[PDB]
Amino acid sequence: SIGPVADLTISNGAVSPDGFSRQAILVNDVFPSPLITGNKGDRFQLNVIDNMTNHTMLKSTSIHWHGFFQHGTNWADGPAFVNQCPISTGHAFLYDFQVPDQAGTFWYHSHLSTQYCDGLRGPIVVYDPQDPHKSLYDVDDDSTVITLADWYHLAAKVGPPTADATLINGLGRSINTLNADLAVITVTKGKRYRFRLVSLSCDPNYTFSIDGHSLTVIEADGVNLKPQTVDSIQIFPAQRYSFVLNADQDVDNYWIRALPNSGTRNFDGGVNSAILRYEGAAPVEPTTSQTPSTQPLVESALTTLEGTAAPGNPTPGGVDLALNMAFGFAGGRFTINGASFTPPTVPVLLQILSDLLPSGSVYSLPANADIEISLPATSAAPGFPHPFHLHGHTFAVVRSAGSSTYNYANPVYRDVVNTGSPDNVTIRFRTDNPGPWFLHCHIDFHLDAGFAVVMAEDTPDVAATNPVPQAWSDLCPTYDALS
Ligand SMILES: *[C@@H]1O[C@H](CO)[C@@H](O)[C@H](O)[C@H]1NC(C)=O
Ligand SMILES: *[C@@H]1O[C@H](CO)[C@@H](O)[C@H](O)[C@H]1NC(C)=O
Ligand SMILES: [Cu+2]
Ligand SMILES: [Cu+2]
Ligand SMILES: [Cu+2]
Ligand SMILES: [Cu+2]
């Protein structure tokens, strides 16, 4: 793997992760993008070298480092026209930030239009030398990262959508390439694995299970939690989980299954599937049967390892500022409280540094306060369920999707939450991270359609807390000169 100091060169190339050839986005000449790695407290210097020539997938790029807090380095966070102008082709831009107090499973991806759907997306693992669950597993390496990804034969900016295939570790089969190579995951009988599940999906959620094995979940979106055995896991776009697998079954091949909520909802011919292979097992497809899932993961039954409480007082409205976000759908555009987000000419953070634009979308947040955000599900926002995600913060899921109850005493903490179907998912966080932070649904087409708002956190202090490198100031004129 690479990092925490590395070059990321972005280019275009042919790929065939399902046997069908299409042009896509490469990171250091490989599809899918390589895993980045660091220890807790490393300083990260990821030099992003834009060498793209393909206009249909945009020649420009910017990278968000999903989950990282970016305290004092809001300029480094990624979202085009919120925190930076995009890097232009022929140029490079250094992302220089630290991760002092985060550790766990994360990822990086394009935050420009729909560009990460064309293959610029990759796992990040920040190991903890003192990890609290270390004693529960023997192996925790590059071989135990598992990524889930949707794959489309025609580019993001080519059709509307429906995945042609599911990619586990970059490999999978579509309905017309049932013979294509599958992803193989190799364990040794009697060893224990910390598997790091990473959804790179642009849209589908996956119900993930492994034939013949139970999963003990110990981490969600970077947050250590109390161990919790399950036999399947619903993972929504941009979410992460660590589960320990006790490789204690017979030496054999076992189907790994990852079934999307949309499109091809079967396992016929090994679509939506990969292979757990015990060492010594033959190089064949598994022939194992799947059991009905009798202990699925339940977000409202998850709790933080330390049992941390929700910020604020343990009662609704028991907070410094309650904001309710009302979803809708106008032209071809999503709306929250009546605003559709259109990317502004001057990125928000630059406006601050210079009411913010785009009007109707920007929410001033005071510092050192408790915030409660409501996001009731509604049929007025088609394409639900929507997984909303808050940059620059972990939040406490005081009430999950599918539930009516309210947990303030020890709710799970996360950075991406399913908001459910027409449900009133509510979250809490403390404002200790001054800057403009994107709040948006992570189904990436809905995002390009404007399904987003920006939290302008402690705006009087953003100028002081986030000094900006010369290279970042150079970004916008360069971009604006391009036709
Ligand atoms: C650029 O990528 C698009 C999207 O996959 C593809 O349709 C097009 O052929 C590519 N351009 C070239 C010159 O290969
Ligand atoms: C969701 O919860 C907030 C919290 O008070 C409330 O104001 C809002 O009306 C609720 N919406 C629905 C649809 O239940
Ligand atoms: Cu993300
Ligand atoms: Cu993010
Ligand atoms: Cu959505
Ligand atoms: Cu985002």
Residue numbers in the entry: 1 to 160, 163 to 356, 363 to 430, 432 to 492
Quote the authors verbatim.
The oxidation of aniline by laccase at pH 3 is hampered because at this pH aniline is mostly protonated, in the form of anilinium cation (pKa = 4.6), and the cation (E° = 1.05 V) is much less oxidizable than neutral aniline (E° = 0.63 V). Even so, the polymerization reaction with high-redox potential laccases proceeds slowly, in several hours. To sum up, even though SDBS was the anionic surfactant producing the strongest loss of enzyme activity, it endowed the best performance as doping template for the enzymatic synthesis of green PANI. Hence, 5 mM SDBS as template was fixed for the next polymerization assay with increasing amounts of 7D5 laccase and 15mM of aniline. The maximum polymerization rate (measured by the increase of polaron signal at 800 nm) was remarkably raised (0.37 < 6.37 < 14.64 mUA/min) in direct correlation with the amount of enzyme used (0.1 < 1 < 2 U/mL), suggesting the catalytic role of the enzyme in the polymerization. In all cases, polymerization slowed down from roughly 8–12 h onwards, most probably due to the inactivation of the enzyme. On the contrary, enzymatic polymerization in the presence of SDBS as template led to a nanofiber-structured PANI. By using a first-class laccase and SDBS as template, we developed an environmentally-friendly method to produce water-soluble conductive PANI with excellent electrochemical properties in up to 75% conversion yield. Its nanofibered structure provides additional advantages like a porous structure and a large surface-to-volume ratio.
